[PDB]
């Protein structure tokens, strides 16, 4: 009996992994020791997200 359960966990997992990616790119661009060729990517990424 797997109708709502699987559905809702999929839905949640979407935004979960999303927010994880958000925090990831955020910290990456924040760590200025990373190149100002990787950063701009992450910046536009956070923009779009």
């Amino acid at each position: 009996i797997d109708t709502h359960t699987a559905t809702d966990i999929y839905q949640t997992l979407i935004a979960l992994n999303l927010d994880t990616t958000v925090n990831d790119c955020l910290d990456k661009l924040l760590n200025d020791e990373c190149t100002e060729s990787t950063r701009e990517n992450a910046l536009y990424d956070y923009y779009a997200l």
Partner: protein, 73 residues
């Protein structure tokens, strides 16, 4: 062969092509078919990460770990 040094002598209409415009043909369908209202411009935070974070005060994570280790016999 003639008139190769000039940029003038044109004809008038006392006008120029304008560029401003507006539109309105309202019956009901365009300008939106008038949906119900909605919301949600910005994303939000789950806050469950801490609830999901490995902590010895885990809601059930440590609890279910101990459950497995005390019930698998």
């Amino acid at each position: 062969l003639i008139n190769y040094q000039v940029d003038s002598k044109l004809l008038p209409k006392n006008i120029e092509p304008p560029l401003t415009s507006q539109y309105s043909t309202r019956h009901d369908a365009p300008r939106g078919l008038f949906p119900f209202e909605s919301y949600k411009p910005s994303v939000q935070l789950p806050d469950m990460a801490k609830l999901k974070k490995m902590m010895n005060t885990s809601d059930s994570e440590s609890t279910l770990y101990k459950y497995l280790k005390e019930s698998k016999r």
